[PDB]
Ligand binder design. Structure first.
Ligand SMILES: Nc1ncnc2c1ncn2[C@@H]1O[C@H](COP(=O)(O)OP(=O)(O)OP(=O)(O)O)[C@@H](O)[C@H]1O
Ligand SMILES: Nc1ncnc2c1ncn2[C@@H]1O[C@H](COP(=O)(O)OP(=O)(O)O)[C@@H](O)[C@H]1O
Lengths: 47, 712
């Protein structure tokens, strides 16, 4: 029950899902504006 | 009476002691003169005296920092001496502590040079710790070096040096060089023996010259692994204060040939140079093991070199040698002769009080939860050496960490301190850790104390009186026997039905004379016969001698009557000197397989029959069992006692256990569907209906016939 407590990882907002990109950009990754709003992200800033 | 009581001081001055004029008058001290205050464990300091009539007579004023430096608590006693040889310092070197300078940068040495030593003339000493205020912090530094010796005073002309690097604080604490008597518990007897063996040659050698004797040198302490032998040796060495130079057996044995001899020679010579000194060894068996099993030349040369060094020790020199070994007989016998390791000391598994003290000492820093009942833990822990207790504490702390970790995330490199504030070990964590331990010392013959009295014995009054007369009287009344010349018998053998309360009688007898009980079950003798067991009966009797007075117990002695073990037992028992406080108590349910030689005079000659408990005895035993389990009010045990004709103590105990199990099962069912925290009549009715007898009547007839024949 608790002996495996260390193994599990607490959930947090910053972790995100992986999907194949429609575009071919490598250094450029696109996310919904809602994710940026929750994380307070804006344009012009590298991740 | 010059000792003065330590009193808490509101002021934080680190070199000023305010005392009443009567304090000076007692020692005839003069105003404006520094004084030396000495505490405990070779801790001392020099302070400037001031007159404070407000302080009551005998009350001093020393800041908490100085008391911490001296390693003393509030209300302790410290010796005060004058300082007629007051001197000023010429060159003093001090370095900072990194954790003390966190939050502020820069060099505070120049900042503190003038303000704190503007003709202050504060006395200084090696190792002193002093706190100065810089910026928004109070930074504490240590006195790394002072010249000229010994302590001197901080004058303005003194040259202050600060070239170096910071040194942690806890590193000094963990060095292990500073461990006093307060760090050991449960070894009062062994500690006293070691102190009387070591201090007198070193602290007061003149006594031996006055009485005209060569002081002893060879001390050898042995016991089960992880019993604190190294810790005890280190503590006593630090208490003495003499120079200490340790030698690790594994380390010495780990270097190529010739290097070991060089190391041993250098260590011995250096110790000789710095008398008084103490030489300690570890796993002396490893460097000088039994020769019959290791015939290599390397161990032979090493042990011969050690013997030569031991022999070459000069007559008058404050040097004492100590050794540690798990098996007393593993080491080469040549080291046990006169002029070598002879003062033998045995360390056994601590008793309930010893375990409580050890647990108290170890758990002095952890954040114990509100509910801690260390007494219960000590009671449950039977056969735990100190190391196992430390492991138990660590495992309980780990379990608490497991419980509290789910709140935090380990991916982040920082953990909120608010969580740390909530850390605390609960009783359930200790219970679980105790569940997940692995004691191993008890698995082999080790001397332990027992505290069973005659009350626990349900009857057999005549046997009690006879055994008392046989054993107890010569233990405390030797003069009578010497006057009449009668030698004391030792070999007492119990015979009778199994499970009739023999080991309990042996424990009671051992507790009567305050002797260390030793148990050797029959399977151990069988394993020794097969040679698988590491220990040998020679080891058992050697430990019994070293731990005298003792009561050795041989359970199921008929299991070996095998002839080799019988012969070895006969030889060891007969070779024993009768006047020694060593007794052997045998148990056996088949008094026929025993060889006649075992019954010869000077051996197991006393025969004692053990009868089945009488109705009164059965009632008393039943009362003894029912002490912690509550019973239905008005419960009557007379019917049970009368209905248990021919039963043994073990059978009645089993009846009680099954009745309690039925009660617990009924409680579980009721809870599922603690209204019944006790037992009622129905459970005892069930148990008695499920009664039986572990001994048939034919066996009783056989035992009665044997007893009558022995009587005739
Ligand atoms: N009073 C004590 N008695 C026994 N062990 C103690 C005591 N206090 C602390 N301990 C713990 O016991 C260990 C110290 O003893 P240690 O394990 O060195 O003994 P040892 O097995 O005799 O040593 P050696 O390595 O020299 O053969 C440490 O874990 C220490 O924390
Ligand atoms: N005078 C007595 N006679 C018989 N049994 C007793 C007596 N006093 C106590 N007992 C109980 O009997 C049990 C004896 O256990 P054990 O030592 O295995 O058997 P034995 O002593 O016959 O070798 C103990 O658990 C103890 O509670």
């Amino acid at each position: 029950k608790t002996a495996t407590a260390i193994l599990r990882r607490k959930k947090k907002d910053n972790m995100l899902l992986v999907d194949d990109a429609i575009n071919d950009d490598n250094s450029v990754i696109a996310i919904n504006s809602n994710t940026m709003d929750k994380l307070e992200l804006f344009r012009g800033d590298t991740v | 009476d010059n000792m003065l009581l330590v009193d808490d001081a509101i002021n934080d001055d680190n070199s000023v002691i305010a005392i009443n004029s009567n304090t000076m008058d007692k020692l005839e001290l003069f105003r404006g003169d520094t004084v030396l205050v000495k505490g405990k464990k070779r801790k001392d300091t020099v302070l400037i005296v001031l007159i404070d009539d407000e302080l009551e007579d005998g009350a001093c004023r020393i800041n908490r920092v100085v008391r911490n430096n001296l390693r003393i608590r509030l209300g302790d006693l410290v010796t005060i001496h004058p300082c007629p040889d007051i001197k000023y310092a010429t060159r003093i070197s001090v370095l900072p502590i990194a954790d003390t300078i966190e939050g502020i940068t820069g060099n505070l040495f120049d900042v503190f040079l003038k303000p704190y030593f503007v003709e202050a003339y504060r006395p200084v000493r090696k190792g002193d710790h002093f706190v100065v205020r810089g910026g928004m912090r109070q930074v504490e530094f240590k006195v790394v070096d002072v010249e000229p010796e010994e302590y001197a005073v901080v004058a303005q002309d003194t040259i202050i040096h600060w070239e170096g690097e910071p040194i942690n604080r806890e590193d000094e604490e963990n060095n292990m060089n500073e461990v006093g008597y307060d760090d050991i518990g449960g070894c009062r007897k062994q500690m006293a023996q070691i102190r009387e063996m070591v201090e007198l040659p070193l602290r007061h050698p003149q006594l031996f010259k006055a009485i005209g004797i060569k002081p002893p040198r060879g001390v050898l302490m042995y016991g089960p692994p992880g019993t604190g032998k190294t810790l005890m040796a280190r503590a006593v060495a630090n208490e003495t204060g003499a120079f200490f130079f340790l030698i690790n057996g594994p380390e010495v044995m780990s270097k190529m040939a010739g290097e070991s001899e060089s190391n041993l020679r250098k260590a011995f010579e250096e110790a000789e140079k710095n008398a008084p000194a103490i030489i300690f060894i570890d796993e002396i068996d490893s460097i000088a093991p039994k020769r019959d099993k290791t015939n290599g030349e390397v161990e032979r040369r090493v042990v011969s070199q050690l013997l030569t060094l031991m022999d070459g020790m000069k007559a008058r020199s404050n040097v004492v040698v100590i050794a540690a070994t798990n098996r007393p007989n593993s080491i080469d016998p040549a080291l046990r002769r006169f002029g070598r390791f002879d003062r033998e000391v045995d360390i056994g598994i601590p008793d309930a009080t010893g375990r409580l003290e050890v647990l108290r000492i170890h758990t002095k820093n952890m954040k114990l939860a509100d509910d801690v009942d260390l007494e219960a833990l000590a009671a449950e822990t039977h056969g735990y050496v100190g190391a196992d207790i430390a492991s138990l504490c660590s495992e309980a702390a780990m379990q608490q960490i497991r419980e509290k970790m789910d709140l935090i995330d380990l991916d982040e490199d920082e953990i909120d301190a608010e969580v740390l504030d909530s850390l605390g070990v609960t009783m359930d964590n200790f219970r679980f850790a105790l569940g997940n331990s692995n004691p191993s010392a008890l698995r082999e013959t080790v001397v332990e104390s027992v505290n069973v009295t005659w009350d626990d014995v349900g009857g057999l009054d005549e046997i009690k009186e006879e055994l008392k007369e046989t054993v107890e009287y010569p233990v405390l009344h030797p003069d009578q026997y010497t006057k009449f010349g009668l030698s004391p018998s030792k070999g007492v053998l119990f015979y009778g039905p199994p499970g009739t309360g023999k080991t309990l009688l042996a424990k009671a007898v051992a507790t009567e004379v305050s002797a260390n009980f030793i148990s050797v079950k029959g399977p151990e003798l069988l394993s020794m016969w097969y040679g698988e067991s590491e220990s040998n009966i020679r080891d058992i009797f050697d430990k019994a001698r070293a731990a005298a007075p003792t009561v050795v117990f041989l359970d199921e002695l008929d299991s070996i009557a095998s002839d080799r073990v019988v012969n070895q037992l006969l030889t060891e028992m007969d070779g024993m000197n009768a006047k020694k406080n060593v007794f052997v108590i045998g148990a056996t349910n088949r008094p026929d397989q025993i060889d006649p030689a075992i019954l010869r005079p000077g051996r197991l000659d006393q025969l004692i029959y053990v009868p089945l408990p009488d109705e009164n005895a059965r009632l008393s035993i039943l009362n003894a069992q029912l002490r912690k389990t509550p019973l239905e009010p008005g419960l009557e045990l007379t019917a049970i006692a009368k209905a248990t004709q021919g039963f043994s103590g073990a059978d009645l105990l089993y009846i009680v256990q099954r009745a309690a199990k039925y009660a617990i099962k009924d409680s579980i069912e009721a809870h599922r569907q603690d209204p019944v925290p006790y037992i009622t009549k129905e459970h005892f009715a069930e148990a008695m209906k499920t009664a039986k007898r572990s001994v048939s009547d034919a066996e009783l007839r056989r035992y009665e016939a044997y007893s009558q024949q022995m009587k005739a």
